[PDB]
């Protein structure tokens, strides 16, 4: 996560608010001063130094973590960005449109913007390239794994923060006293933009015994809950048949149409797109719009604020309308009891914010504040006619103190307990702390209980016994968190392999079409999803698609979901193929691959290096998260459950499951445990609270935490 944040996310944050334009009006009392000046400061490429420290007397030298721990320094490195100053001027002729030109003062020029704390053993740290003898020379323990920050000489670990996944439609049954029976909400969030969270709630009024059960949705920046038909007509879908086609995908599902009948009756008197937009414009919360501009205000709200995770550009009203219809369809499916309400505790519906995303959002806030200060100083200099000093414009202490304060104290802002002092009682205690996850807690769910989806991702018995029981979780041994990839290549690939776009999709002519979702965004439909899923799986198993990408085919409700976002917890699994030579399902990994692995391992203690990525690229293993785990069948043991079927009475009773359609096999079942639970001898012979007590108490033992 830290390497992703340093290598890619920093430039993305810089390029999001790169250009800072200041326009100076002529303010001309006489026509002799009819010139308007346009000053632009633009941030370019960002540079990072090796970790280093500047002392009192101004000398800057390389800082190593041993010195930074001893001298109570911060193991940080400098950030430098390229700034090009643009000066545009134009003749201020009233009525005539201004055409600016450069005065050739395009000065450019690395400028120091702050110190980013460097997590140890990351790509920027000195200890990444260090050998064992180099680590001994630097008085660093070779057993030390890194993974932490040094802030003021304290080893700070960033606890992974668990949050609900974004861009997922979740339908919730409200309480009996509430007039709203069901609520379908989506926490619509975007990654390549302002990172603002806009929640669209589609709500179904009236209880089951009631008759006037209408559906009203909570658009952002709107004081009232607009009926869904008015929103559909405001999106350009006037007739009732097209609206019901967008919502109900089966013409024979008359019960869904019967529940939609009060909704179309409610917004019956609005029959035009402009009337619907002006109706939305009446309820605008800004309250500064004149009589005639409410149409454009409603269009602007529907474009830049209504479901921003799909698009922010114009001309995408059809996709937003189809997604709104999909939300209403899911809401009515739960309302008709065809599907249960969404499980809040499903671990596939969760994301874990590691050091990467946490430092990313913190640096986004700090850099927005820094750009605001740059513009404020620049406006002061151009208004009060003082000379512009480049060094006073960028206050590097802003970014430096923000990162240092949010890492030294756990308060993630300007959420507590994000950064904790790293445990150093034993080695296993440090390992357990570096894989610890935290779930902030006031909802109606049950997050403290161990869920089914927690299999192989978090430890079944490793949690504190106090008030943090179940809220604080520890990763299993093989579990990994995805760092996130760009969904644009996958979306481009899908549209060139038969995915019909959502603009020219009609559900009644394509009743068997499978909806295609990429990162929670409905991008279109596919007529033949089976061979598409086969193509996608063959690309991922050969490494063409990044192995962290999770692709889920839900055959029952005809959905193909692809997730490329960060924060997904996955685990490796063996691949079980058809294997027509043996006539039965078998693991793709064979004894030759195992021999290559042991040959590489014993060479490390001259043949080709056969690494874990060699298994990953040859399709022998695969990365499965909790969403994809819902659509696969896993065998616990290869040699016991793959081949088709006197027993030792001392052995435990095993079931063969009487089913040979396996798609995956567990690598080893002992890998469902975390660091502290893997110390326990025979944990399967113990009562589970005793395993939890030992996992808590293994961190309080005495050993040799580090050799240095």
């Amino acid at each position: 996560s830290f390497n992703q944040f340093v290598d890619y996310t920093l430039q993305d944050i810089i390029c999001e608010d790169s250009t800072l334009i200041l326009e100076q009006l002529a303010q001309h009392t006489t026509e002799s001063d009819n010139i308007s000046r346009k000053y632009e400061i633009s941030f370019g490429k960002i540079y990072v130094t090796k970790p280093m420290v500047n002392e009192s007397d101004g000398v800057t030298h390389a800082l190593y973590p041993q010195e930074a721990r001893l001298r109570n320094l911060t193991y940080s490195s400098g950030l430098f960005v390229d700034v090009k100053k643009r000066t545009y001027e134009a003749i201020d002729v009233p009525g005539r449109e201004l055409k600016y030109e450069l005065i050739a003062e395009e000065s450019e020029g690395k400028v120091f913007i702050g110190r980013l704390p460097i997590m140890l053993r990351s790509k920027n740290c000195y200890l990444s390239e260090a050998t064992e003898s180099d680590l001994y020379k630097l008085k660093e323990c070779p057993f030390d794994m890194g993974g932490y920050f040094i802030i003021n000489g304290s080893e700070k670990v960033l606890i992974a923060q668990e949050r609900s996944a974004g861009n997922i439609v979740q339908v919730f049954k409200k309480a009996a006293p509430s007039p709203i029976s069901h609520v379908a909400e989506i926490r619509s969030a975007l990654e390549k933009g302002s990172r603002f969270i806009s929640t669209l709630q589609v709500k179904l009024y009236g209880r089951e015994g009631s008759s006037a059960r209408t559906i009203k949705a909570t658009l952002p920046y709107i004081k009232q809950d607009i009926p869904i038909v008015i929103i559909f007509r405001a999106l350009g879908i006037i007739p009732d048949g097209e609206i019901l086609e967008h919502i109900c995908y089966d013409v024979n599902d008359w019960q869904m149409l019967e529940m939609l009948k009060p909704c179309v009756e409610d917004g019956f008197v609005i029959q035009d797109r402009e009337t619907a937009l002006d109706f939305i414009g009446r309820r605008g919360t800004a309250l500064g719009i004149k009589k005639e501009k409410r149409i454009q205000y409603a269009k602007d709200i529907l474009q830049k604020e209504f479901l921003p995770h799909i698009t922010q550009l114009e001309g995408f009203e059809s996709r937003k309308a189809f997604f709104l219809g999909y939300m209403i369809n899911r809401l009515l499916l739960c309302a008709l009891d065809r599907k249960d309400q969404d499980d809040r505790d499903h671990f596939g519906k969760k994301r874990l914010d590691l050091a990467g995303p946490l430092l990313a959002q913190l640096f986004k806030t700090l850099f927005k504040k820094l750009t605001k200060d740059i513009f404020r100083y620049m406006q002061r200099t151009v208004e009060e006619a003082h000379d512009f000093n480049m060094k006073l414009a960028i206050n590097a202490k802003t970014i430096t103190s923000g990162l240092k304060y949010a890492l030294a104290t756990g308060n993630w802002g300007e959420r507590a307990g994000v950064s904790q002092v790293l445990n150093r009682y034993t080695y296993s205690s440090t390992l357990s702390h570096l894989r610890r996850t935290n779930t902030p807690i006031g909802k109606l769910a049950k997050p403290r209980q161990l869920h089914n989806t927690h299999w192989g991702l978090v430890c079944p018995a490793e949690t504190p016994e106090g008030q943090a029981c179940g809220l604080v979780k520890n990763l299993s041994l093989m579990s990994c968190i995805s760092v996130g990839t760009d969904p644009m290549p996958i979306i481009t690939f899908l549209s060139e392999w038969g995915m019909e776009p959502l603009e020219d999709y009609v559900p009644h002519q394509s009743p068997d079409a499978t909806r295609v979702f990429v990162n929670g965004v409905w991008h279109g439909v596919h007529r033949n999803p089976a061979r598409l899923m086969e193509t996608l799986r063959t690309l991922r198993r050969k490494g063409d698609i990044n192995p962290e990408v999770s692709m889920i085919r839900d055959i029952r409700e005809k959905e193909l979901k692809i997730f490329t976002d960060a924060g997904r917890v996955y685990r490796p699994l063996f691949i079980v193929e058809d294997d027509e030579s043996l006539g039965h399902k078998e693991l793709k990994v064979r004894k030759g691959h195992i021999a290559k692995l042991m040959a590489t391992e014993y060479q490390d203690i001259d043949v080709e290096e056969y690494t874990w990525s060699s298994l990953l690229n040859e399709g022998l293993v695969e990365y499965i998260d909790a969403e994809e785990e819902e659509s696969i069948l896993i065998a616990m043991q290869p040699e016991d459950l793959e081949p088709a079927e006197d027993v030792d009475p001392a052995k435990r009773i095993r079931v063969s499951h009487h089913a040979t359609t396996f798609t995956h096999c567990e690598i080893h079942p002992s890998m469902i445990l975390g660091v502290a639970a893997s110390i326990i001898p025979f944990p399967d012979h113990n009562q589970s609270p005793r395993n939890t007590y030992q996992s808590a108490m293994g961190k309080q033992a005495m050993g040799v935490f580090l050799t240095n």
Binding site: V421, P464, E465, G466, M697, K699
Partner: peptide, 24 residues
């Protein structure tokens, strides 16, 4: 300060539970 995982119950400290339900 201290950092211990052995949970010691804070006695005489029901005000956390009193403040959880202040209205009836």
């Amino acid at each position: 300060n201290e950092n211990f995982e052995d949970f010691d119950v804070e006695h005489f400290s029901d005000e956390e539970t009193y403040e959880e339900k202040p209205q009836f």
